[PDB]
C-alpha cells in the first residue's frame, strides 16, 4: 500500500461458462468537491406548481451507480444473452475502488496548476443496512458509461423528504453521512465489498408464440354452450327466444376460456407521424396520472401494457413507454428524431394494448322495455384468473429497483422494468475529506470556510455473476433474433465515430426467443 | 358456505365503532347539516364495520330462461361481455367466478358467465334452451358478487354546501386488499385441469 | 413512511428516459402538432418514470367535522359507499385502507 | 507507516447494546503555530479592575477538548438517552490522532502557496499524571464541533498562576511543556491512548 | 515495488552455447497519448482509387513489436549465425516491461514543464488468444531500433476491417481494447510474459 505501487488491475471481461455468465467492468472516475463540503437544505422555489414542490437535502457525498445493463454487458455480450436464453437474473456482485489519486488544484491568477496530494484521504462507505434514503433505481444520469474507455463524473448524492409545499414537516428526517463509519483511503489504499442477490425470479426474456385467446384446438368443438342468439324470426314479429351453441373455430371469439388478460390503466395515444396527432396542449391535460397527497404525478411508464396492436406500429402510447435519448441529445424539448422510443409489442399476447379499453361490462338489467347497455373498462384492477408479462428490459435500461418497505405490495416488479429487490445492491458513497487552508494564528471558534481545492480520481470495478436460463424449444422453423444488418454505412453500429464519440443507435430489448403459453 | 360475508358477526352485541348515520338535523324548520354518529347492531345491520369485502367482478348481461322476459334484439354479441386482445374481441366465457343470480330469482342465468352443457343428441348450432343444461353458481352468493349486478358504488365528486354527493356504480372491479372469493364449481362432465400459461405474471391461477 | 411513493428519487440527477412533454408547436401562427420529448428532473417532477403505483381505492363520500360545510340532506345511506351481496346492500365500513384526508 | 498509506479510518457511530452505549466521533482539525513557537508571560493590563487582574503564560501548544455532550451524541442519540434512561455515566474512553499532514506555507509577495512537508513532525503528549494546570472543564470554546462534517481549529493552551495585581508571586509556577516526554508524529504515524473513568455516580436524568 | 526502487536491469547480450543461441535485447521506449484517448473510425478519403479504399479504426493503444532480426542480433552476432549454420529457428521468447515512469507535461503559455506523476498507471495486456486483428508481420515501422542506445516511440495500434469503398459492411467488426483484462502498472510495477514457439522448420540458411 504505497505511493508508487498499484492497488488493483483492469478487469473488464465477460466469461460464459454454462448456466452462468460473469460480467466484469472497469471505469475511471473523477470526484469533485460537492457543495464546498456543506450540507444544504434544498427545496422547490416559492413560485411553482403544487405537483412540483419538493423538500430535501444535498450532501457533499458522491455515489457510484451501475444500474444500467450497458454498464456490464457489451452489445455483443447482450446479443449472446438474448438470442440464447429464456431468462436471466443476477446472483452476486463484487465491487472495487482502487488506484485513487487525490489531486490538489491551485488557481493562481493566470493558470490552473494541478499537483498530487499524497497524504490526502477519500471517505468511502456502503449503506449496507438500508438506513439512508435510496436514490438509486430512479433512472438517473451519472452511471458507469456504456463504453469502457470513457471517464465519468461521480454524481452528487441527494435525497428528498416530506414537504408541505416548499416547507418542511416535523417528520422530515435529516441524514448526516459523516455519522456512518467510512473507510478512509489514501493512495495505496483500496476499497472492496461483496454482495449476494436475493432469490429473484428470472426475467422473462422470451416472447409468446400463442396469444391468450388463441389457446385451444381449432379442430375440436367445446362441450360447453354459450348464448348465441337472443331473438328468432317467428314469422314477422321477431319474438325473443334464447338460443345456445357450441363454439368451434368458426365462432372463435366466444369460447369458454380459463384465463383473462392482465391489468390495464388506459393511456392517451400519440402518433410518431406528427400530422395524426391533435393540435393542442395535452401533454399534461390528456396525461394519465395518479393523485397522491393532493398532487398529481405522471404515470410513467406505469403497468406493463402493449404499446400498440397489429399493423399499427406508428403509435406509442404517451408515457407508457421508456423513451431513451440518442447521443448528444439536449435535455429539454427535443423532437422525436432525437429520441429512441421503445416498444412493448411482444406482450400483445397477454397484456392489453395501453391505448385501448380492457373490455366491456354491462351497466343495467335489461327487461322487455330496457335494453342491454355496456360501458368500456378503461381502468381494470386485478381479477382472479389474470396472467400477464412484465415490462421488457433494455441494454440501456435499469437493472434493479428497491422494493419500498411498506405493509403491502402486489407483484413487486419495477414498472420501469428490471428486478424488484427488497435488499438491493447497497449505495456506495464517496467524498473527499476536507483539507483546510491555513488557520488564523489566533483561535476562532467559527467553523472552517476555507479549504484546499482538490478532487480525486481512480478506477472502479463491478463484477456481477448472472444466472442463465437456457431454452428447450421443440420449434421447427427458425426464430427471430437480434442481428446487425450487413448493408454498408458510414458508421458501424455501437461503435465510436471519427470524433471518438460512442453511440448506441437503438434500444435492444431482451425478448427475441419464443415460448408457448 | 353456510354464512355470507356481510352476515359474519354476533347479532346480539353492538360494535364499539361508529359510523356516520345522519347528515342533517331538523333544527326547527331550517334542517341544518349536523353530522351524527351511531353504533351498529342488528337493527342497522347493513352498515357495520367489516374486515373483508367480496371478490372481483366483471359484469355480464342478464338473460332469462323464460323467453318472454328477454329483449327482442340481437344482443348475443353486441350486448356481450368481452375482452380486447391485439385488436380482436373475444367473448368472456365463462370468465371470473361470480354468482349466476341472487335469491328467489333462479330463472336468470347471466349470458356467458355459466358453463352450458348440451343434452344427449343435441346438434351443434342454434339449439333451443330445452336442448341444453345451463349450470348454476348459486352456492357462491356468500362471497362472490352476482354476475349480472354491479359491485357497489363509489363517490365521483367532492360534495360542498352547494354540490351534492353523487355515486357511480362499479361494474368492473379488480382485486383489492381484503377480497375473499370462491372459485368456479366443477361438474361431472366439466374439465378437470388446465395448463397454466407460461408467462411472467399470473394472479390466482385457477382455470 | 418518511417518503411518499411519488417522491422516491434523487432530485439532483435527471432520468435517462423521455416522456411526451409537448404535443403542438407554434410553427408561425398555425400551431401544428409536433410530438416533443423531454427528460424529467426536479423541475418537471410530476411526470417522471416510476416503478410503483399506489394501492387500491374504493371512493367514499367526504364529510366535514365542521357542520356548516356538510350538505343539508339525508345522504348517510344514499350517499354511502356500499357493496351488493345476494340482493341486499351493506355499508362498506371501514373498507380498504385509504388515507382519510390530504395535506392541510 | 508510510506517506501514501492511511493510518486510520473514519469511526463516527453510536451503538446501543443494553445497559451500555458507545459513542464514537471523528473530526478533522487544523493546528497552526501558536505564539511563533514562543512561551509568553501574559497578564492583565495595568489599567484594569482588581477583580479582573490575572497573571499567566501562553504556550505554543494546542489542546484537544471533547468536553461537550454534542461532541459524542447526535440529537437523535441524545433523544434515545433522555426518554429511556433514569441515569447515565461514562465508563472509559479511547482517543486517536491519525492521518496527520504537515503543510508548509510560503508567502512570496503575491500569492500564498501551500505544499506538503513529509519529513516534519508534530509533538503529542497526554498529561496523564495531572502535573500541568487543568484548563479543561471551564466551558471554553474550541471543542469538537456538534456536526461531524465541520473542521475545527485546535485552541491555544494557556494557564493562569498566582498574581498580586498584574504582577507575579514567588509561588507562581512556570511550566515548560517541552519538558514532558512527547511522541513525535510524521505522516504515517498515529497517536492513541485509552482512559478508564473512575466510579462516578449516575447523573440523575429524571424529574 | 516502490518509487525509488528499480524493477529490472539492463539485459542486452547474446550467448552461444552449442545448438542454441539466446539473444537478449533491451531498449528504452516512450509512449504518448494516442488520439487523445479516443477510438476513431478511419477510412480512405472519398476521392481515391478503388484499390486504395480502406475502412478501419485507430485506437489509443500502442504496441510493442520486435519482428526484425536486428532487434535481437548485432551484426557480429548475425555474422556468427550465417557463416556457421545451415539453419536456425526460434524456440521461445521472454518479454519484460520495467522501470516505468509516467511523466505529466504542462504547457503554461511560455514553457513546457515536465514532472513525474507517481500515482499514474499504464495499462498493458497481451493478446495471447488471437482475438484482435493481427497487424504485426506486415513490415511496419516502429520496431525496436537496431542499436541498443536508441530510444524509440511506441507505434499506434490500428486495424482495417471490411469495406465497400470508404464505407462499412455489416460484417465489419469493431474491437474495444479496454474490453480485455489488462495489467495496470505504476512506477515500481513491471510486466512479464513468456511464449513458446511452435515446431517451425529451420530456415534454410545455405545456398
UniProtKB/Swiss-Prot annotation, chain A:
GO terms for cellular component: host cell nucleolus; T=1 icosahedral viral capsid. Keywords: Capsid protein, Clathrin-mediated endocytosis of virus by host, Host nucleus, Host-virus interaction, T=1 icosahedral capsid protein, Viral attachment to host cell, Viral penetration into host cytoplasm, Viral penetration via permeabilization of host membrane, Virion, Virus endocytosis by host, Virus entry into host cell. Its main location: virion. It is found in: Virion; Host nucleus, Host nucleolus. GO terms for molecular function: structural molecule activity. The keyword Hydrolase does not apply. AAV capsids serve as viral gene transfer vectors that have been shown to affect long-term gene expression and disease correction with low toxicity in animal models, and are well tolerated in human clinical trials. GO terms for biological process: clathrin-dependent endocytosis of virus by host cell; symbiont entry into host cell via permeabilization of host membrane; virion attachment to host cell. Capsid protein self-assembles to form an icosahedral capsid with a T=1 symmetry, about 22 nm in diameter, and consisting of 60 copies of three size variants of the capsid protein VP1, VP2 and VP3 which differ in their N-terminus. The capsid encapsulates the genomic ssDNA. Binds to host cell heparan sulfate and uses host ITGA5-ITGB1 as coreceptor on the cell surface to provide virion attachment to target cell. This attachment induces virion internalization predominantly through clathrin-dependent endocytosis. Belongs to the parvoviridae capsid protein family. The N-terminus of VP1 is sequestered within the mature capsid. It contains a phospholipase A2-like region and putative nuclear localization signals. The ratio at which VP1, VP2 and VP3 proteins are synthesized in vivo is about 1:1:10, which is the same as in the mature virus particle. This is Capsid protein VP1.
Amino acid at each position: 500500500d504505497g505511493v508508487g505501487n498499484s492497488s488493483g488491475n483492469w478487469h473488464c471481461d465477460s466469461t460464459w461458462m454454462g448456466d452462468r455468465v460473469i460480467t466484469t467492468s472497469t471505469r475511471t472516475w473523477a470526484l469533485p468537491t460537492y457543495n464546498n463540503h456543506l450540507y444544504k437544505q434544498i427545496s422547490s422555489q416559492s413560485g411553482a406548481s403544487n405537483d412540483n414542490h419538493y423538500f430535501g437535502y444535498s450532501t457533499p457525498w458522491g455515489y457510484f451507480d451501475f444500474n444500467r445493463f450497458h454498464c456490464h454487458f457489451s452489445p455483443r455480450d447482450w446479443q449472446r444473452l438474448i438470442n440464447n436464453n429464456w431468462g436471466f437474473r443476477p446472483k452476486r456482485l463484487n465491487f472495487k475502488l482502487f488506484n485513487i489519486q487525490v489531486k490538489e488544484v491551485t488557481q493562481n491568477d493566470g493558470t490552473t496548476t494541478i499537483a498530487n496530494n499524497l497524504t490526502s484521504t477519500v471517505q468511502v462507505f456502503t449503506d449496507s443496512e438500508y438506513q439512508l434514503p435510496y436514490v438509486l433505481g430512479s433512472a438517473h444520469q451519472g452511471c458507469l458509461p456504456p463504453f469502457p474507455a470513457d471517464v465519468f463524473m461521480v454524481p452528487q448524492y441527494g435525497y428528498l423528504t416530506l414537504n408541505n409545499g416548499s416547507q418542511a414537516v416535523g417528520r422530515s428526517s435529516f441524514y448526516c453521512l459523516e455519522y456512518f463509519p467510512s473507510q478512509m483511503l489514501r493512495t495505496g489504499n483500496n476499497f472492496t465489498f461483496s454482495y449476494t442477490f436475493e432469490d429473484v425470479p428470472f426475467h422473462s426474456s422470451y416472447a409468446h408464440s400463442q396469444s391468450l385467446d388463441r389457446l385451444m384446438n381449432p379442430l375440436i368443438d367445446q362441450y360447453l354452450y354459450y348464448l348465441s342468439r337472443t331473438n328468432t324470426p317467428s314469422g314477422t314479429t321477431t319474438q325473443s327466444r334464447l338460443q345456445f351453441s357450441q363454439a368451434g373455430a368458426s365462432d372463435i371469439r366466444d369460447q369458454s376460456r380459463n384465463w383473462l388478460p392482465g391489468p390495464c390503466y388506459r393511456q392517451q395515444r400519440v402518433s410518431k407521424t406528427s400530422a395524426d396527432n391533435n393540435n393542442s396542449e395535452y401533454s399534461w391535460t390528456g396525461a394519465t396520472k395518479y393523485h397522491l397527497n393532493g398532487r398529481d404525478s405522471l404515470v410513467n411508464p406505469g403497468p406493463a401494457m402493449a404499446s400498440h396492436k397489429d399493423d399499427e406500429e406508428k403509435f406509442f402510447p404517451q408515457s407508457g413507454v421508456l423513451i431513451f435519448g440518442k447521443q448528444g441529445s439536449e435535455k429539454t424539448n427535443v423532437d422525436i428524431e432525437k429520441v429512441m422510443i421503445t416498444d412493448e409489442e411482444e406482450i400483445r399476447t397477454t397484456n392489453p394494448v395501453a391505448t385501448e379499453q380492457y373490455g366491456s361490462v354491462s351497466t343495467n338489467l335489461q327487461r322487455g322495455n330496457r335494453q342491454a347497455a355496456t360501458a368500456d373498462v378503461n381502468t381494470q384492477g386485478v381479477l382472479p384468473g389474470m396472467v400477464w408479462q412484465d415490462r421488457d428490459v433494455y441494454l440501456q435500461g435499469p437493472i434493479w429497483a428497491k422494493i419500498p418497505h411498506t405493509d403491502g405490495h402486489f407483484h413487486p416488479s419495477p414498472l420501469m422494468g428490471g428486478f424488484g429487490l427488497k435488499h438491493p445492491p447497497p449505495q456506495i458513497l464517496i467524498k473527499n475529506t476536507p483539507v483546510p487552508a491555513n488557520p488564523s494564528t489566533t483561535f476562532s471558534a467559527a467553523k472552517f470556510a476555507s479549504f484546499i481545492t482538490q478532487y480525486s480520481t481512480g478506477q472502479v470495478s463491478v463484477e456481477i455473476e448472472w444466472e442463465l436460463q437456457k431454452e428447450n424449444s421443440k420449434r421447427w422453423n427458425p426464430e427471430i433474433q437480434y442481428t446487425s444488418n450487413y448493408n454498408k454505412s458510414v458508421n458501424v453500429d455501437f461503435t465510436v465515430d471519427t470524433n471518438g464519440v460512442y453511440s448506441e443507435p437503438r434500444p435492444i430489448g431482451t425478448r427475441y426467443l419464443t415460448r408457448n403459453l
